[PDB]
């Protein structure tokens with residue numbers, strides 16, 4: 001038995017196994033655009049993804065993760081509110097059962113159809129397991145998805161999902177370029193927060209991009225055909241794997257733009 005997004009084990013239950021769920025710097029949050037503070041000292045993001053090496057795609061029972069080689073500085077995030085170099089280790093999505101929901105963050109209470117998380121860890125801590133124990137250990141780039149036009153650079157991911165339908169399945173996934181998932185503008189909001197899945201550690205600098213990317217209804221439809229369950233178990237569609245907004249408490253959201 002274990003956490004998930006169902007009626008008996010979803011986000012409202014997580015605090016019993018993970019008391020940090022009611023902590024002071026939980027994610028996601030609603031981004032109130034009129035209350036966010038423009039901060040001129042914020043630097044532009046530096047995304048260096050030209051030498052990225054993707055390796056594998058995995059259904060972990062809660063999402064699917066595209067994994068990268070993070071044994072060297074190949075795909076890194078620098079700049080913005082960050083000090084130091086953060087290496088890309090994996091990206092994943094959260095999505096809904098319907099187009100009107102699915103994102104984790106919201107903007108002026110608006111929900112998007114899905115949210116992309118590019119997860120990076122701070123190289124000064126040596127490995128990902130050490131980094132998540134540190135308040136400045138991770139940086140996650142969050143990108144909203146809206147339904148409209150198709151996203152050409154997402155199609156290679158959509159076409160492999162049939163091969164990892166059920167929990168624990170993986171497939172080789174080499175030569176994927178994550179630059180094809182970025183919006184035109186890199187303007188962002190940032191705040192200190194947490195992982196949005198157990199163990200919910202408060203180790204994340206969130207960088208949430210203002211500009212959404214567009215994907216087609218057929219693309220997001222294929223996400224909704226994945227399964228939470230393992231092969232041979234009763235079928236439960238992988239939908240609504242998002243955590244709702246958490247109280248902002250003593251935090252300020254900063255904007256890189258006006």
Ligand SMILES: [Zn+2]
Pocket residue numbers: 092093094117196
């Ligand atoms: Zn996530």
